[PDB]
PDB file of all heavy atoms in Angstrom:
ATOM      1  N   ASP A  44     128.823 -48.928 142.350  1.00  0.00           N
ATOM      2  CA  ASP A  44     128.622 -48.343 140.991  1.00  0.00           C
ATOM      3  C   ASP A  44     128.304 -49.459 139.992  1.00  0.00           C
ATOM      4  O   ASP A  44     127.629 -49.245 139.004  1.00  0.00           O
ATOM      5  CB  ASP A  44     129.898 -47.618 140.554  1.00  0.00           C
ATOM      6  CG  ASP A  44     131.090 -48.570 140.665  1.00  0.00           C
ATOM      7  OD1 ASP A  44     131.329 -49.303 139.720  1.00  0.00           O
ATOM      8  OD2 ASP A  44     131.745 -48.551 141.696  1.00  0.00           O
ATOM      9  N   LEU A  45     128.785 -50.651 140.247  1.00  0.00           N
ATOM     10  CA  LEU A  45     128.517 -51.790 139.323  1.00  0.00           C
ATOM     11  C   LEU A  45     127.030 -52.151 139.365  1.00  0.00           C
ATOM     12  O   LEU A  45     126.381 -52.274 138.343  1.00  0.00           O
ATOM     13  CB  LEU A  45     129.339 -53.002 139.764  1.00  0.00           C
ATOM     14  CG  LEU A  45     130.696 -52.984 139.058  1.00  0.00           C
ATOM     15  CD1 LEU A  45     131.706 -53.793 139.873  1.00  0.00           C
ATOM     16  CD2 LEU A  45     130.552 -53.605 137.666  1.00  0.00           C
ATOM     17  N   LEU A  46     126.492 -52.330 140.544  1.00  0.00           N
ATOM     18  CA  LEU A  46     125.047 -52.694 140.681  1.00  0.00           C
ATOM     19  C   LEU A  46     124.165 -51.681 139.940  1.00  0.00           C
ATOM     20  O   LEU A  46     123.168 -52.040 139.342  1.00  0.00           O
ATOM     21  CB  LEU A  46     124.666 -52.704 142.165  1.00  0.00           C
ATOM     22  CG  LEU A  46     123.601 -53.777 142.421  1.00  0.00           C
ATOM     23  CD1 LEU A  46     123.279 -53.835 143.920  1.00  0.00           C
ATOM     24  CD2 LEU A  46     122.328 -53.434 141.640  1.00  0.00           C
ATOM     25  N   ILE A  47     124.525 -50.423 139.978  1.00  0.00           N
ATOM     26  CA  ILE A  47     123.707 -49.387 139.278  1.00  0.00           C
ATOM     27  C   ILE A  47     123.802 -49.602 137.766  1.00  0.00           C
ATOM     28  O   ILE A  47     122.805 -49.631 137.074  1.00  0.00           O
ATOM     29  CB  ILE A  47     124.227 -47.991 139.633  1.00  0.00           C
ATOM     30  CG1 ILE A  47     124.229 -47.818 141.154  1.00  0.00           C
ATOM     31  CG2 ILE A  47     123.316 -46.931 139.005  1.00  0.00           C
ATOM     32  CD1 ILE A  47     125.153 -46.660 141.536  1.00  0.00           C
ATOM     33  N   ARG A  48     124.994 -49.755 137.254  1.00  0.00           N
ATOM     34  CA  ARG A  48     125.164 -49.971 135.786  1.00  0.00           C
ATOM     35  C   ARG A  48     124.518 -51.301 135.370  1.00  0.00           C
ATOM     36  O   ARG A  48     124.286 -51.540 134.201  1.00  0.00           O
ATOM     37  CB  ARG A  48     126.659 -50.004 135.451  1.00  0.00           C
ATOM     38  CG  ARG A  48     126.852 -50.100 133.932  1.00  0.00           C
ATOM     39  CD  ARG A  48     127.219 -51.538 133.547  1.00  0.00           C
ATOM     40  NE  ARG A  48     127.883 -51.541 132.213  1.00  0.00           N
ATOM     41  CZ  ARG A  48     128.128 -52.672 131.608  1.00  0.00           C
ATOM     42  NH1 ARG A  48     127.162 -53.316 131.013  1.00  0.00           N
ATOM     43  NH2 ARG A  48     129.339 -53.159 131.602  1.00  0.00           N
ATOM     44  N   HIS A  49     124.235 -52.170 136.313  1.00  0.00           N
ATOM     45  CA  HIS A  49     123.617 -53.485 135.967  1.00  0.00           C
ATOM     46  C   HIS A  49     122.118 -53.293 135.676  1.00  0.00           C
ATOM     47  O   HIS A  49     121.635 -53.669 134.627  1.00  0.00           O
ATOM     48  CB  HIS A  49     123.822 -54.450 137.153  1.00  0.00           C
ATOM     49  CG  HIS A  49     123.037 -55.724 136.955  1.00  0.00           C
ATOM     50  ND1 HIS A  49     123.026 -56.408 135.748  1.00  0.00           N
ATOM     51  CD2 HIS A  49     122.226 -56.438 137.798  1.00  0.00           C
ATOM     52  CE1 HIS A  49     122.230 -57.481 135.900  1.00  0.00           C
ATOM     53  NE2 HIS A  49     121.716 -57.547 137.130  1.00  0.00           N
ATOM     54  N   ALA A  50     121.382 -52.737 136.605  1.00  0.00           N
ATOM     55  CA  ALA A  50     119.915 -52.548 136.389  1.00  0.00           C
ATOM     56  C   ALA A  50     119.663 -51.465 135.335  1.00  0.00           C
ATOM     57  O   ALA A  50     118.946 -51.675 134.375  1.00  0.00           O
ATOM     58  CB  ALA A  50     119.258 -52.134 137.708  1.00  0.00           C
ATOM     59  N   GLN A  51     120.237 -50.303 135.512  1.00  0.00           N
ATOM     60  CA  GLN A  51     120.028 -49.184 134.535  1.00  0.00           C
ATOM     61  C   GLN A  51     120.319 -49.643 133.096  1.00  0.00           C
ATOM     62  O   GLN A  51     119.839 -49.053 132.147  1.00  0.00           O
ATOM     63  CB  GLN A  51     120.965 -48.024 134.886  1.00  0.00           C
ATOM     64  CG  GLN A  51     120.808 -47.644 136.367  1.00  0.00           C
ATOM     65  CD  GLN A  51     120.194 -46.246 136.487  1.00  0.00           C
ATOM     66  OE1 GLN A  51     119.171 -46.071 137.117  1.00  0.00           O
ATOM     67  NE2 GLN A  51     120.782 -45.237 135.904  1.00  0.00           N
ATOM     68  N   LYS A  52     121.110 -50.674 132.927  1.00  0.00           N
ATOM     69  CA  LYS A  52     121.441 -51.149 131.548  1.00  0.00           C
ATOM     70  C   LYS A  52     120.555 -52.336 131.156  1.00  0.00           C
ATOM     71  O   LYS A  52     120.328 -52.581 129.985  1.00  0.00           O
ATOM     72  CB  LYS A  52     122.908 -51.584 131.501  1.00  0.00           C
ATOM     73  CG  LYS A  52     123.808 -50.349 131.435  1.00  0.00           C
ATOM     74  CD  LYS A  52     125.011 -50.634 130.531  1.00  0.00           C
ATOM     75  CE  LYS A  52     125.368 -49.374 129.738  1.00  0.00           C
ATOM     76  NZ  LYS A  52     126.026 -48.389 130.640  1.00  0.00           N
ATOM     77  N   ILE A  53     120.072 -53.083 132.114  1.00  0.00           N
ATOM     78  CA  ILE A  53     119.221 -54.266 131.784  1.00  0.00           C
ATOM     79  C   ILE A  53     117.863 -54.161 132.492  1.00  0.00           C
ATOM     80  O   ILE A  53     116.826 -54.268 131.863  1.00  0.00           O
ATOM     81  CB  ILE A  53     119.950 -55.544 132.223  1.00  0.00           C
ATOM     82  CG1 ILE A  53     121.296 -55.634 131.497  1.00  0.00           C
ATOM     83  CG2 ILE A  53     119.108 -56.776 131.869  1.00  0.00           C
ATOM     84  CD1 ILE A  53     122.388 -54.979 132.345  1.00  0.00           C
ATOM     85  N   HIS A  54     117.857 -53.968 133.788  1.00  0.00           N
ATOM     86  CA  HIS A  54     116.562 -53.871 134.522  1.00  0.00           C
ATOM     87  C   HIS A  54     115.933 -52.496 134.274  1.00  0.00           C
ATOM     88  O   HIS A  54     115.041 -52.356 133.459  1.00  0.00           O
ATOM     89  CB  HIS A  54     116.805 -54.078 136.022  1.00  0.00           C
ATOM     90  CG  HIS A  54     117.330 -55.467 136.257  1.00  0.00           C
ATOM     91  ND1 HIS A  54     116.563 -56.598 136.031  1.00  0.00           N
ATOM     92  CD2 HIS A  54     118.550 -55.924 136.698  1.00  0.00           C
ATOM     93  CE1 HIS A  54     117.320 -57.669 136.331  1.00  0.00           C
ATOM     94  NE2 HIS A  54     118.540 -57.315 136.744  1.00  0.00           N
ATOM     95  N   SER A  55     116.393 -51.479 134.965  1.00  0.00           N
ATOM     96  CA  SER A  55     115.826 -50.109 134.766  1.00  0.00           C
ATOM     97  C   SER A  55     116.507 -49.128 135.725  1.00  0.00           C
ATOM     98  O   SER A  55     117.517 -49.436 136.330  1.00  0.00           O
ATOM     99  CB  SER A  55     114.318 -50.129 135.035  1.00  0.00           C
ATOM    100  OG  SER A  55     113.625 -49.802 133.837  1.00  0.00           O
TER     101      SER A  55
END
Side-chain angles (χ1 to χ4, degrees):
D44 54 86
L45 270 157
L46 213 177
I47 304 161
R48 185 257 201 189
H49 171 46
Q51 308 247 124
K52 283 217 143 74
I53 301 92
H54 297 293
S55 244

